Subunit: 332 residues, 4 copies
């Protein structure tokens, strides 16, 4: 046999530059997996700025239903083994080329799954990596699966289509913004079976992408079209954020609870009326302006810093003045 750890290796599923991907099965539980074998020698001869060494030590063991799981990593003197979730689905966009567009309900279900993984990635990844639809798969059960968990898509080998406006240009971007735009063309591809901007050659293609105007099939209700317009904003400052999509009526319909974490937000019952009023007075602003910061966790805003100074230095203690610790702290 070919055996590493608790896993017995099998047929070769594909070959990369740095090694092959063999099918495997846990010797005890019998579950099937996909094991990527990276050869230390091949890596050493290639990775001279330490990029790959780096990408590998940035991996985490991802448990999310819609991202390919990295169950664990096993090391040997000459090799490194990555035991992953086995997914035989092929690309999602390949399914769309074959089957055509899907119905609203299957589009929404899948879209909610994909967006669930993207959000999870934003939270837990050492370094950001752009969402690529080629890396979106669908397993035997018709479930979305993100192929790239921080090392390249090992699953698939062998485009003429999408790029975000900031990306087509030489412009600097954060990447959740472009993930939204990317997630926009995916959602569109699901409902329509086409890309929102597919023009024939390169000059006219990336031209309309900057225009932002896209065709709207008749069977698209104005609710999903409003969402699609917001996600596809050419101006990243005007573009929808994950929270925007999360609060959109079209998206929220039949949304499974387990998908997104229950993030504690700011509640009206926390509000300190005296402090709110003091700030609005000492500044020029209105309550909406200050409340907006508290609800959106805009804590570095001079209004929020002031409000917090008043809360923390109250002599009498309140039940709702303590939302501080449950939260993570932000960075500068």
């Amino acid at each position: 046999s070919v055996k590493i750890g608790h896993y017995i290796l099998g047929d070769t599923l594909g070959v990369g530059t740095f090694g092959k991907v063999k099918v495997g099965k846990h010797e005890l539980t019998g579950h099937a997996v996909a094991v990527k074998i990276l050869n230390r020698q091949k890596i050493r001869s290639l990775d001279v700025v330490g990029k790959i060494r780096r990408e590998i030590q940035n991996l985490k063991l991802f448990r999310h239903p819609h991202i390919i799981k990295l169950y664990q990593v096993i090391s040997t003197p000459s090799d490194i083994f990555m035991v992953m979730e086995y997914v035989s689905g092929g690309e999602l966009f390949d399914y769309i080329c074959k089957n055509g567009r899907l119905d609203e309900k299957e589009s929404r279900r899948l879209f909610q799954q994909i967006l669930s993984g993207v959000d999870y990635c934003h939270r837990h990844m050492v370094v950001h990596r752009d969402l690529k639809p080629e890396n979106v798969l669908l397993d035997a059960h018709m479930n979305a699966k993100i192929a790239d968990f921080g090392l390249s898509n090992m699953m698939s080998d062998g485009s003429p289509n999408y790029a975000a406006p900031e990306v087509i240009s030489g412009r600097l971007y954060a990447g959740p913004e472009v993930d939204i735009w990317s997630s926009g063309v995916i959602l569109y591809a699901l409902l329509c079976g086409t890309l929102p901007f597919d023009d024939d050659h390169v000059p006219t293609l990336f031209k309309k992408i900057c225009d932002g105007i896209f065709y709207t099939p008749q069977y698209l209700n104005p609710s999903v079209i409003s969402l699609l317009k917001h996600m596809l904003q050419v101006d990243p400052m005007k573009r929808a954020s994950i929270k925007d999509i999360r609060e959109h009526e079209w998206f929220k319909q039949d949304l499974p609870k387990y998908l997104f974490p229950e993030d504690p937000s700011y509640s009206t019952t926390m509000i300190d009326d005296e402090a709110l009023k003091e700030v609005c007075e000492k500044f020029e602003c209105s309550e909406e302006e200050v409340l907006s910061c508290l609800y959106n966790r805009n804590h570095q805003d001079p209004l929020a810093v002031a409000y917090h100074l008043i809360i923390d230095n109250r002599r009498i203690m309140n039940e709702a003045k303590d939302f501080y610790l449950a939260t993570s702290p932000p960075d500068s």
Copy 2:
């Protein structure tokens, strides 16, 4: 006329190598703050391996109630201002040496606060930093506050304990030593002296420990678990959290709630199945799952079994809002 952002700077409260620390007050709200002024010139001339630069950019704005708050940082061409919570109380270990030991009621309260900040630090500090009891202050309101959130005990310008592993200079993770460190603090509150150090440096090493007349057997078991010489046997944060003496009058806001405990864990099938195929006990498998030990072949097997279930949503996917661990 010394004003930065919304803050007017005052008397110099303390002077460091890279800049001084001035007291300030907010220009609109009257609140007092403590502003650390870091000089780009002094720093540039001194940290040549980039330690200080790194440490500064690893800072986050800590808003925990028992850790000194960093409200905001303001940048100028020649300086970097750190607007922090102003706490004018002295070191806690200083208060215990002058006025005597405290009572069970006040010791527990203070200890719970301190451990709350320590846990918070373990969670969100980028690089670990040993908890030093000298960095624990006590304000006018008698609330514990940890001074070092990742630069320095910024506030202020004496036998020394260190964990066994630290004294012998061996390799350690540091939450382990933080537990040990918090052990001598807890002891100090109840006693007013340190559990081992009566001495100068040589004999302090090898130095159980003395147990004053009224110490209920409940708190002695806790202190005993925290002060274990063997780190593999030493108490963990979760152990203290579940200890009876600790659970008494424990403020709600102190710790976050994500322990995965019964119904959300219970897989009767995988529980025993792993315990069968691997020859081990339930306790061992349970232990890996509660911790970030998912890389343990027991946890990996368990998860393989869980993720391949037919229909179970409650246990299988509902737990996946927390974070992944690393290899």
Copy 3:
């Protein structure tokens, strides 16, 4: 009256998402510069995973002659100013499309400059970034300058080539693709067209390459080595450095001198001894030593033999001013 540090800002030269780029001139010396203004507010509202923040703090002040220089960075409460070298020439690939291909003499010169900057980037850039030929400009003095030193092609607001490994979306180190990328640039200088792309996207993948009438067999061998489809067979920076066509009229200042080559390497004893105990050739062992491949069991064995020598200072310890590689 827009002045930052010693610099007076001018007409807006370009506007980005996070701030604009204004031209400036030094207040004392008349020199012109290009100042990127980054807005803390825009950034804070957009990079929520900290990518931009990270990228900014990974910046170093690059003074290489063929890479856009970052002279200094100035910080204000609301903004971050980047004082850079002002280069008003257009993209190099733009110059080649309008006015025709260049001659061997000028192509070699430009190519040597470009590779010099690329090598510099490989050495001192914290995170690797693929060399994009669109980011290569050409100044009024006809000297190549790479625009992206680690933030963005900051200067300016068209078929696209990508290395085989990049197009298929597979894992890569990136100096490999930089060689490939520099290959199509070198080809562009001599030809005035791209080596494969005649097309739109599908056929560009699988797409040796055409060889115009007078191309001496010396430059065709180089281009052939750089444009290898298999990265394991592809030319490395050191290969190009040692190539005959490249070595011609090569400016002194371009590359640093630390190749360890003959007398400083020669260990006749370890050379063969490793080659004996391991069954392999001299070429293989030599290859690991020249590179940072010291982790190869051949190099480890060789070093074990070297460090345990009796008296040899010249080869043994004299080589240890460079840097260690990592595991």
Copy 4:
């Protein structure tokens, strides 16, 4: 046998929390080594903030004569092996307790070796780590060896003495500064056989450390005493730097060439007289002020930035105007 990779394990030299250190020998070349075996299970149960995982991935393979070499790291599913240089010397400060002080020549030789390693560490280490004299060993040939290369000293198990002023206090420091101070008490220990500040109990001990005044035995020539005073400056801004020590006459005597790298510095022949004069005129300064920046690589100084702007924008090109690329770039 007990064999990992090309190495055959042997007698246990000591036991750590996370594993033992066994003697080993290369199966082919026969050279003896010390192999630290770190157990993945022990690490996982302890390292929960990821400190140790981190320290290990920060390791580099150090080739320096006076720092313990990490020849390579070998990985297995349950273990990690670190193959290091075998050094049987015991602590340097232990040798001093036994033998007493050394002569100037053996002190200088050893001091030059130690300082050579410290400088190397400053250059190549991901994260700074304070120099501890307990971690300074001397091999069978009387050669200084730094035990901690970025993971704890594995070599030795089982103090009442030194700490730098910034360290005794709660003060923030860079650490090459305190390394100098640390290296100061080591040099002193070598010549004297005692520590410069050894007072009896803790109150009086750290008190004199802040005073900086120390006893000076008669057999100490004023040249080494000047060096010792500079290294032991209580004010870190006044304290000697590696370059200061490097240029000191006492240190430079009989200094082996291989010890320190030949760093290119700034030479008089590079000087641009017109540019130097322009700067001094447009500013208030003198040539010394500007030259000092160029010689000390103080390039972020407004004088240096100005000087460089003039050099880089000269129309005619010079041979000596190009010192730029041979250098590494600095950080902000």
